[PDB]
A paper describes a structure:
To better understand the interaction between [name] and GS-9770, the protein was co-crystallized with GS-9770 and the X-ray crystal structure determined at 1.3 Å resolution. The iminohydantoin moiety of GS-9770 engages the essential catalytic amino acid residue D25 in each monomer of the [name]-1 PR homodimer. Additional hydrogen bonds are formed in the P2 pocket between the imidazole and the backbone nitrogen of D29 as well as the P1′ carbamate to the backbone carbonyl of G27. The primary interactions observed in the P1 and P2′ pockets are hydrophobic in nature. In light of the fact that the iminohydantoin core of GS-9770 was found by X-ray crystallography to engage the same D25 residues in [name] PR that are present in all the off-target aspartic proteases tested, these data indicate that protease specificity can be attained through modification of the P1, P1′, P2, and P2′ drug moieties. The V82 residue is located within the inhibitor binding pocket and makes van der Waals contacts with GS-9770 in the P1 pocket near the phenyl-triazole moiety and with the difluoro group in the P1′ pocket. M46 is located near the edge of the binding pocket, close to the flap residues, but does not make any direct contact with GS-9770.
The active [name]-1 viral protease (PR) is a homodimer with 99 residues per monomer and belongs to a larger class of proteolytic enzymes known as aspartic proteases (also called aspartyl or aspartate proteases). These enzymes contain an active site with two aspartic acid (D) residues, one from each monomer, essential for coordinating peptide-bond cleavage.
Residue numbers in the entry:
A (entry chain A), B (entry chain B): 1 to 99
Write the structure that this text describes.
């Protein structure tokens, strides 16, 4: 499919038993989700964007259902104002920019 | 052309007659550039949400060329991690996400 950019490109994902709305974000290196429970070990990280930085927990090897795919990747969990699918997952579903 | 997402989608832009590197950012509503001089008057805008908010200068109807595609639109100037081409200009150049 083709997703135009007249509006924020939002999709529904399934992760950790939960459904979430998230933004397809080519400006994000990694996926960042609002606070939620995830399995496995994690390590703290600081991530920067407009306005400064927030502290998040980094989980690796997380399965996310998105755009008809089952993709594996890193998920950062913390006080993000929006759920974000970053490039680390976008590549796995074959998403590209085209013009 | 098609741009994959294994690396940051950095491209060359031209603004004010000068070449700069900028990030094609589907997660950005707006285009925000590192400090530079632009013509005319500006108006205030507040953007952000990652650890805080930043004041930026908003300039309207600015000529900016992105990968050879000429656009004219709103450019914000302020303290951004890197020059960002947001959806306001990605739409002008016909950019979409595809999978
Ligand atoms: C992954 C990050 C970087 C977060 C981030 C994001 C996206 C959407 C919202 C969002 C949407 N709705 N809401 C509100 C309703 C609740 N919040 C909030 C944050 N995603 C993204 N692409 N951008 C860029 C900056 O990206 C970068 O710096 N990239 C990097 C590169 F430069 F190196 C990696 C640094 C950007 C530029 C210019 C603008 Cl105007 C906007 C923008 N559009 C809308 N709001 N904003 C706001 F941010 F100003 C975003 C982000 O800041 C991270 F890491 F912080 F989480």
């Amino acid at each position: 499919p083709q997703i135009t950019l007249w509006q924020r490109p939002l999709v529904t994902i399934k992760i950790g038993g939960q459904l979430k709305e998230a933004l397809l974000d080519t400006g994000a290196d990694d996926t960042v989700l609002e606070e939620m429970s995830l399995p496995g070990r994690w390590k703290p990280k600081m991530i920067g964007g407009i306005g400064g930085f927030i502290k998040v927990r980094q989980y690796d090897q997380i399965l996310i259902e998105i755009c008809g795919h089952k993709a594996i990747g890193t998920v950062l969990v913390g006080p993000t104002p929006v759920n974000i699918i970053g490039r680390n997952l976008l590549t796995q579903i074959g998403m590209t920019l085209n013009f």
